[PDB]
Design a protein around this ligand. Structure first.
Ligand SMILES: [Mg+2]
Ligand SMILES: [Mg+2]
Length: 96
RNA sequence: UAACAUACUAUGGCCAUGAAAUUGGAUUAUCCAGAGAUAUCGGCUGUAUGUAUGGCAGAGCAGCUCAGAGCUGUCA
């Protein structure tokens, strides 16, 4: 429930971007508050992103699932290896 | 209108920019996309048994003369 609900929330109230380019760009520009990576993420991206985040001190969430679960979770109809939560109004996770 | 010379075009693939849900794009057929589709006075690249010029008209071809030389057209 934590994840599904949290993200559903984040989507309703908040701003996020899906995908690799938008996620990295988000880290770069500093807009990225929280980063999600899937089980299916190609390694190179998993480690690359992991690095961009450590360096920018953003917190990375490793999802419990694969592309479909992510996309579905975000109430989108497309698959996503990596995702960025920008601003979520009501969800606790952003803060902890 | 030869190989060959130079410059351009050629079913595909790439690079930017930006991301797509009232999902779109696309083939006769399939098929592709947030693992970034579509789209930009956008850009790069690959293949001619393509185009232009050189070759080349002087050659070849078709006619017409002169007593071996000569003339005309070979176009769009
Ligand atoms: Mg082309
Ligand atoms: Mg002649």
């Amino acid at each position: 429930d934590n994840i599904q609900s949290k993200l559903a929330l984040v989507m309703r109230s908040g701003k996020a971007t899906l995908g690799y380019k938008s996620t990295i760009k988000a880290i770069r520009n500093g807009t990225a508050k929280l980063v999600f990576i899937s089980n299916n993420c190609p390694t190179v991206r998993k480690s690359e992103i992991e690095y961009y985040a450590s360096l920018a001190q953003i917190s990375i969430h490793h999802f419990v699932g694969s592309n479909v679960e992510l996309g579905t979770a975000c109430g989108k109809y497309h698959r996503c290896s990596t995702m960025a939560i920008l601003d979520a109004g009501d969800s606790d996770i952003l803060k902890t």
